[PDB]
Amino acid sequence: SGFRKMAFPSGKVEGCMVQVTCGTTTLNGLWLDDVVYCPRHVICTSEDMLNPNYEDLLIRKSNHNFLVQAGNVQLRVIGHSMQNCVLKLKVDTANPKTPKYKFVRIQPGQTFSVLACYNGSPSGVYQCAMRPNFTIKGSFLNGSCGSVGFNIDYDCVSFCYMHHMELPTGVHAGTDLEGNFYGPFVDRQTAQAAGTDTTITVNVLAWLYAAVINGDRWFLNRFTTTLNDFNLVAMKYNYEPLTQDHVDILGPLSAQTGIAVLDMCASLKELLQNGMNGRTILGSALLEDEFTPFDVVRQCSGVTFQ
Amino acid sequence: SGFRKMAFPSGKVEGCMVQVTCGTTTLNGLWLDDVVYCPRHVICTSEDMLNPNYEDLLIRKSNHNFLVQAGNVQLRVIGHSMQNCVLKLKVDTANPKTPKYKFVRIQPGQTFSVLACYNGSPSGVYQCAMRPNFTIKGSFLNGSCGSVGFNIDYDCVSFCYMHHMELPTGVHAGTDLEGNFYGPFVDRQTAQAAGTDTTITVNVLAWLYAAVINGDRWFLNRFTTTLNDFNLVAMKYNYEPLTQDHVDILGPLSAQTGIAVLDMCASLKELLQNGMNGRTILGSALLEDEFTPFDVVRQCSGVTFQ
Ligand SMILES: *[C@H](O)[C@H](C[C@@H]1CCNC1=O)NC(=O)[C@H](CC(C)(C)C)NC(=O)OCc1cccnc1
């Protein structure tokens, strides 16, 4: 037993991390086969980053302007091109550590692991959710751009995130690995801001099931509620609507615990209306919304990856 | 910016994880050079685990009773011996992925990363602290024994934990890699229980500094306190005494924020006496004690590892 914010083992992604330097700018790249992927603002300098035109900036570049270092070994750039907000540097060496992989784009509410990197060297790994407002609450310092987010499914790495910037509230924005931003953000210095967020209701319910599985039961009650009556309360507390698909996805956890989904909704209702009364759930004094139903089943059952 | 519970990149440890099967029991082993380390209760069966004598059990064993699988490749056991509560299986192949490593024993209050594993396959990674009562609040299911805890220092893996069991409160107990238990626990089925815990005061202060660094300032105040007067309040709320060494270790974070350690103690005092009043610190509604001063400096500064 126990329930922890758990990341995927990072080894398969560590073997892909490289350092990309162009001019004064150094950041991380992702080396898969003979391509290195990195944020396109590497071609920028401190006065270029105000309002740049990357197509104009990139034609002025040469292959030899791009210094790529994989550990203590320098990779020769033999081609370059831009794909939306990422750069693809073609190198003369295929990464022998390339895992089986996919480029996937995730949905708000879904979770992934982040391998934070500086100078092409991995620093730490942690779990993130894509917020409803398409930001992530990460931990990123200068030099972390190009760090990637991912999930692992048996042996296959699904890359879903490349880090690009921090917003003024301290949250983070980035792209999928095709270079398309998550949310209404651009890789320029403007007055961009996150904008309003909501709480991921289905995830909170998943976590309440995790709690019951782990022996926290004090918030359970004999009452029930209809889906519509729950959603009236959800809206008042800035929770997203729960759909019948959410109810269906919570079926397995319902069945394992014997607690009907709508019953657990009544519990959430009371928790929202009365608070916690000085008690905790799974060591938290707040309702936690960054575990998906999949995360709970994985951890509270024990799935591995080769 | 941002502050997350961050584990070390796990790749160096993933390359050491193997599966050890003896009779009906399967668990994880740690393969370094030509030795596989695993919990000695692998030599036990369901009626042996009540009150065993492992010396008697082990002389009855043959090398060929031990099935060791590194991925899809079977390692020939050529020797075995017991070291306290771990078994050392000598194998005919040195692990070509052996990192530079040390076996270290950690102190209560210190943190480490856990690579949770099943059947020799890594499942997830997460950060743990050694509680003052020598338990860890982990996430471990059947088959997880032999999973190891570790820290990484540049390129060197310091192994500090091997998982052995779960206590009746859902917390976890294990050994260092010399096979000596953390705390007053034995690898047998008895009525063992955790016993009383305390909150790691120096870590809470470290986390308050992390919060200030990240823009959470509402809990700051103009008051100060003496170390003795703080420790009188600490004892009342079941916090460990703060020592002058703790104060010294918090110096750098004090200097970075301009908040004297004893000033931050006055803030902690008020937080303990008034609670949080519906506010949060770094996304938590409780005082967090599983980040060390080192963890805060590492994350709030950006140290990496090769
Ligand atoms: C890339 O390494 C960097 C990552 C930032 C730096 C601090 N935390 C991060 O996540 N990204 C940027 O510096 C980005 C550059 C572009 C606007 C994409 C061109 N700008 C940015 O994040 O500005 C906000 C910021 C910068 C530095 C410190 N705090 C906030």
Ligand SMILES: *[C@H](O)[C@H](C[C@@H]1CCNC1=O)NC(=O)[C@H](CC(C)(C)C)NC(=O)OCc1cccnc1
């Ligand atoms: C080893 O894989 C296993 C790990 C346990 C199982 C559930 N969570 C864990 O951490 N360890 C044991 O089963 C251990 C065996 C010895 C007493 C060391 C011989 N016993 C144990 O942990 O008993 C408590 C328990 C077992 C199973 C489920 N919940 C609690």
